[PDB]
Amino acid sequence: TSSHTVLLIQTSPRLDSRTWGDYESVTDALDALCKMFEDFLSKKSAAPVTYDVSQVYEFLDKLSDVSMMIFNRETGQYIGRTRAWIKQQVYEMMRGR
Amino acid sequence: TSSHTVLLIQTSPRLDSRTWGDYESVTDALDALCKMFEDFLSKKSAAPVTYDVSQVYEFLDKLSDVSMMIFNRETGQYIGRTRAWIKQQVYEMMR
Amino acid sequence: FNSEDIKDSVFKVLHAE
Amino acid sequence: SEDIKDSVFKVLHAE
């Protein structure tokens, strides 16, 4: 039930900030985005040891662009997902963890 | 018709060399790759330069990874195309 | 923080070995 | 690899 996922990211308004990685499953791609926030949160000095989903949302809003292309086993093609869908999936994953 | 196309490129074996751009149509994305080959050919000799079809292909094999994701209006999804498909289309556009 | 800090965090996780 | 990257970045990220 794992589907190849391409994660597209543009970190800054600059076009040369467009980078990408691919993952074995959508869950892996969502986990990678959470790890990115945790790395970013680590750099903050003097902060609470707990973080809320709202902060994860704020980190994703800092990205100029974030989207996913998820392989659909039925069609053989990739379904595109944008930031709002990604936020919801991250919320569901965190609430279940 | 015009179909949203994402061009994925990895220039070196390093994973952090993975970059991408998107275009309004497959033709634009294919044209960009040809622009890239011509730019690369310029710096090698710094002279007027002619190239063979094999050299055109070789530039695409020199990239660690190149692929395209082409939006299909009928399916509403993106078709993945890999290097072999791109090489064929780049040649046809060149011809 | 700035955009480079954002890029560093993205690159660290996305392009890890 | 640097020469290839320069050519790719010039066209891909042109504005």
Total domain count, chain B: 1
Q: Which of B14, B16, B37, B31 is nearest to B68 (CA)?
A: B31
DSSP chain A: ----EEEEEE-SSSGGGEEEEEESSHHHHHHHHHHHHHHHHHHSSS--S---HHHHHHHHHHSSEEEEEEEETTTTEEEEE-HHHHHHHHHHHHHT-
Q: Torsion angle, CA of B33/B89/B23/C11, rounded to 10 degrees? A: -60
**Cα dist from C17 to A7, A62, B82, whole Å:** 17, 25, 23
Map tokens 């039930």 to a residue: A1
With beta carbons less than 8 A apart as the criterion, state whether B94 and B56 touch.
Answer: yes
Pairing of strands A77-81, A65-72: antiparallel
- Alpha-carbon distance of B12 to A64, in angstroms, equals 25
Which among B13, A89, B4 is positioned nearest to C15, based on CA atoms?
Answer: B13
Distance, CA of A61 to CA of A1 (rounded, Å): 29
In this structure, what token pair is assigned to residue B48?
A: 């007027």
Contact flag C6-A39 (C-beta cutoff 8 Å): no
* Chain D interface disruption, residue of A8, A14, A16, A18, most D CBs within 10 A: A16
Judged by a CB distance cut-off of 8 A, whether residue B42 touches chain A is no
The one-letter code for the residue type at A93 is: M
Residue in chain B closest to C17 (alpha carbons) equals B15
Subunits next to C (3 or more Cβ pairs <8 Å) are A, B
Query: Token pair of B65, please?
Result: 């990874």
Query: Other CB atoms closer than 10 Å to residue A3's CB: what's the count?
Result: 16
Tell whether D13 lies on the interface with B, counting CB pairs under 8 A.
yes
Q: For chain D, what is the largest distance between any 2 Cα atoms, rounded to a whole number of angstroms?
A: 23
Please note each residue after which chain C is broken, C-to-N distance over 2.5 A, or write none: none
Show the tokens assigned to A63. 């990205």
Query: Bridge partners of B78?
Result: A78, B71
CB-based contact, A17 to chain B, within 8 Å = no
Q: Whose structure tokens read 């033709």?
A: B27
Which candidate in A78, A79, A81, A82 is best for mutational testing of the B interface (most B CBs within 10 A)?
A78
Resolution of the solved structure (Å): 2.2
Beta bridge partners of B6: B22, B69
What 3 state SS string does B24-54 have?
CCHHHHHHHHHHHHHHHHHHHHCCCCCCCHH
Tokens representing residue A46 in the block: 């003097």
Q: Write out the H or E segment, with its range, that includes residue B76.
A: none
Q: What is the separation of C-alpha A27 from the centre of its chain, rounded to a whole number of angstroms? A: 10
Residue range(s) defining the domain that contains residue B31: 1-95
* Solved with: X-ray
Tokens found for residue B24: 């309004």
Phi/psi region, residue A72 (left: phi>0; alpha: psi -120 to 50; beta: rest), is beta
